[PDB]
Amino acid sequence: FNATRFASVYAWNRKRISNCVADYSVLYNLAPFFTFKCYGVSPTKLND
Amino acid sequence: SKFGAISSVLNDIFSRLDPPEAEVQIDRLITGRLQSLQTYVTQQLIRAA
């Protein structure tokens, strides 16, 4: 999320995340990330 | 049977979704299972006759 450079839309970058504890409150509490609408799962339930 | 819902197990629906749409999913599942049970009872009545 804090990467200096993002790739273009056609050459979208893909990252693998596995084998770690994930806390979703670190990104949720940030003000700039306004548009956070979530499909197939509630945004609140992500912590569980 | 999923009956057109995302999952066929109830606790998944509770644990993944918010009440506003979890209620829709639960409603779909409940109507499906009620229809199944009513069909069973109707065939049982016919066979009993």
Does A48 contact B at CB distance below 8 Å?
Answer: yes
The secondary structure of residue B4, as a DSSP letter, is T
Measured distance CA(B9)–CA(A44) in Å, rounded: 20
Contact residues for B22 (Cβ-Cβ < 8 A; gap 6+): B13, B14
- SS3 string, A21-47, reads CCCCHHHHCCCCCCCCCCCCCCCHHHH
Of A40, A44, A45, the CB nearest to B6: A40
Closest CA to B14 of A45, A24, A47: A45
Q: Indicate the Cα dihedral angle A39, B20, A29, A18, nearest 10°.
A: -40
Measured distance CA(A36)–CA(A26) in Å, rounded: 14
Does A42 contact B at CB distance below 8 Å?
Answer: yes
Does B18 contact A at CB distance below 8 Å?
Answer: yes
Length of chain B counted residue by residue: 49
Show contacts of B31-37: CB within 8 Å, 24+ apart. B31/B3, B32/B1, B32/B3, B32/B4, B33/B3
Way the structure was solved: cryo-EM
Across B1-49, where does the E strand assignment appear? none
